[PDB]
Amino acid sequence: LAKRIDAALIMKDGRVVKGSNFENLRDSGDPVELGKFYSEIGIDELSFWDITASVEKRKTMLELVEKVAEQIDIPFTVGGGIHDFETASELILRGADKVEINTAAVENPSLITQIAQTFGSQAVVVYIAAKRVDGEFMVFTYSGKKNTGILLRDWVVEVEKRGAGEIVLGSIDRLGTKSGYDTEMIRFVRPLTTLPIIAHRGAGKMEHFLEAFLAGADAAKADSVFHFREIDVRELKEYLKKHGVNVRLE
């Protein structure tokens, strides 16, 4: 099974929030330059997540997408408060390959179908933030602030039915930790969907990526562990290939 390594970049006002430790870059906080560098060292796909204030947010995200599409030749997603079809459409047309949606999809699951009808399922990534509550995996919205009362098991099935292309499974039980991806959650979700599962939250060392792939993840996404250079991307790819994981190098 081919496996993918993804890097996520959190952005505000056109800048990478908290930057990165790559001293070789002209501007280690420029999301375009940082994303281009990642694409040259072994990242397979990029995610750009925007948290800009509402008044400049739409134009900021559109300008980001346009610049990234010109400079980078790997697929990328954009996300962060994409609430309706028109917003998703303008970002895809401006250059993004995929949009990543969460709270708006939970509140209006037909948004998944509406985007997929024009852009295909492959353009729709649903990010599912989940946490254990009273012994059950529950779906959370609004950056983890709201327990929806929807079971993870039910939402995964609905997301596929509505036409999503990929699911990013983010474990709130691992946010800020470096103890590993939530492999129990990945194993819980794996039999429920045919879609690619992207693990998110908890990665602290290269072996954690191996564990996530053994759990059934098709891709593993991380952020600060790469930006602060706790894990080197090329070392990670060499490690995974050494231990039998079908990852891409050259």
Residue numbers in the entry: 2 to 251
Task: Give the text the authors published on this PDB structure.
Computational design of KE07 involved construction of a theozyme to catalyze the chemical reaction, which was then grafted into the scaffold of imidazole glycerol phosphate synthase (HisF) from Thermotoga maritima. Catalytically essential residues from the initial design include a base (Glu101) that facilitates C−H bond cleavage, an H-bond donor (Lys222) to stabilize the phenoxide intermediate, and a π-stacking residue (Trp50), which was designed to stabilize the transition state and favor substrate binding through interactions with the aromatic ring of the substrate. This initial KE07 design (Round 1; R1) catalyzes the cleavage of 5-nitrobenzisoxazole, with 103-fold rate acceleration over the noncatalyzed reaction and a turnover rate (kcat) of 0.018 s−1.
This is mirrored in their location within the protein; in contrast to the initial mutations that affect the active site directly, the mutations in R5 (Val12Met) and R6 (Lys146Thr) are remote from the active site. The Val12Met and Phe77Ile mutations, also in the second shell, cause changes to internal cavities that cause a slight rotation in the backbone at Trp50 that also favors the alternative configuration. To the solution sampling of these states, we used HREX-MD simulations, which are among the most comprehensive computational methods to investigate conformational sampling.
